[PDB]
């Protein structure tokens, strides 16, 4: 699968992160990201996808070595960490045709794993509207500890 790039945008307090909600298969909440184009550098893909989905341009803020990367079923997703973006920033996607909504979420309130169904004696995980964000939350929490305190 083709790598994806995007961003974890945080506010000035470092409390909140910016998530986007799509439609249909992409109906839950996730960090803004998308598929790399042929010959496109990871940093340009991230900025491009973030600008398409949020209307916010990260290019002046990207730091080359500040990202979290996960390989999930053989697909690499790398989210550059972009702290310090004011909470009153006005975000608007390129088309409401892909992005339903854009919101800040408290990091401490977001799940960092899904819950099983052990009270129901059933295998697997309960649905969670943050399932695409979830795999980045523990690594982000740890990364913020190691770079801010
Ligand atoms: C198909 C599995 N899945 C992906 C998402 C996801 O990426 N959510 C956030 C998002 C939505 C639309 C975007 F264009 C970009 C990012 C949710 N479920």
Swiss-Prot record:
Decapping metalloenzyme that catalyzes the cleavage of the cap structure on mRNAs. Removes the 7-methyl guanine cap structure from mRNA molecules, yielding a 5'-phosphorylated mRNA fragment and 7m-GDP. Necessary for the degradation of mRNAs, both in normal mRNA turnover and in nonsense-mediated mRNA decay. Plays a role in replication-dependent histone mRNA degradation. Has higher activity towards mRNAs that lack a poly(A) tail. Has no activity towards a cap structure lacking an RNA moiety. A motif (Nudix box) lies at residues 34-55. Its main location: cytoplasm. This is m7GpppN-mRNA hydrolase. One of its GO terms (molecular function) is 5'-3' RNA exonuclease activity. Keywords: Cytoplasm, Hydrolase, Manganese, Metal-binding, Nonsense-mediated mRNA decay, Nucleus, Phosphoprotein, RNA-binding. Expressed in brain and testis. Not detected in heart (at protein level). Found in a mRNA decay complex with LSM1, LSM3, LSM4, EXOSC2, EXOSC4, EXOSC10, PARN, XRN1, CNOT6, UPF1, UPF2 and UPF3B. Forms a complex with DCP1A, EDC3, DDX6 and EDC4/HEDLS, within this complex directly interacts with EDC4/HEDLS. Interacts with DPC1B. Interacts (via N-terminus and C-terminus) with TRIM21 (via N-terminus and C-terminus). Associates with polysomes. Interacts with LIMD1, WTIP and AJUBA. Interacts with DDX17 in an RNA-dependent manner. Interacts with ZC3HAV1. Interacts with APOBEC3G in an RNA-dependent manner. Interacts with ZFP36L1 (via N-terminus). Interacts with NBDY. Coiled coil: none annotated. It comes from Homo sapiens (Human). GO terms for biological process: deadenylation-dependent decapping of nuclear-transcribed mRNA; histone mRNA catabolic process; mRNA catabolic process; negative regulation of telomere maintenance via telomerase; nuclear-transcribed mRNA catabolic process, deadenylation-dependent decay; nuclear-transcribed mRNA catabolic process, nonsense-mediated decay; regulation of mRNA stability; regulation of telomerase RNA localization to Cajal body. It is found in: Cytoplasm, P-body; Nucleus. Residues 1-131 form the Nudix hydrolase domain. GO terms for cellular component: cell junction; cytoplasm; cytoplasmic ribonucleoprotein granule; cytosol; nucleoplasm; P-body; RISC complex. Mn(2+) binds at residues 49, 53. Disulfide bonds: none annotated. Phosphorylated at ser-249 in a MTOR-dependent manner. Belongs to the Nudix hydrolase family. DCP2 subfamily.
């Amino acid at each position: 699968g083709v790598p994806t790039y995007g961003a974890i945008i945080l506010d000035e307090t470092l409390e909140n992160v910016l998530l986007v909600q799509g439609y249909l298969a992409k109906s839950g909440w996730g960090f803004p990201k998308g598929k790399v184009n042929k010959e496109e550098a990871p940093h340009d893909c991230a900025a491009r996808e973030v600008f398409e989905e949020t209307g916010f341009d990260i290019k002046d803020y990207i730091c080359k070595d500040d990202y979290i990367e996960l390989r999930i079923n053989d697909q690499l997703a790398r989210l550059y960490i972009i702290p310090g973006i004011p909470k009153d920033t006005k975000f608007n996607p390129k088309t409401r045709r892909e992005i339903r909504n854009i919101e800040w979420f408290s990091i401490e309130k977001l799940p960092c794993h899904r819950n099983d169904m052990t009270p129901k004696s059933k295998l697997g995980l309960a649905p969670n509207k943050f399932f695409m964000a979830i795999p980045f939350i523990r690594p982000l929490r740890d990364w913020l500890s190691r770079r801010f305190g």
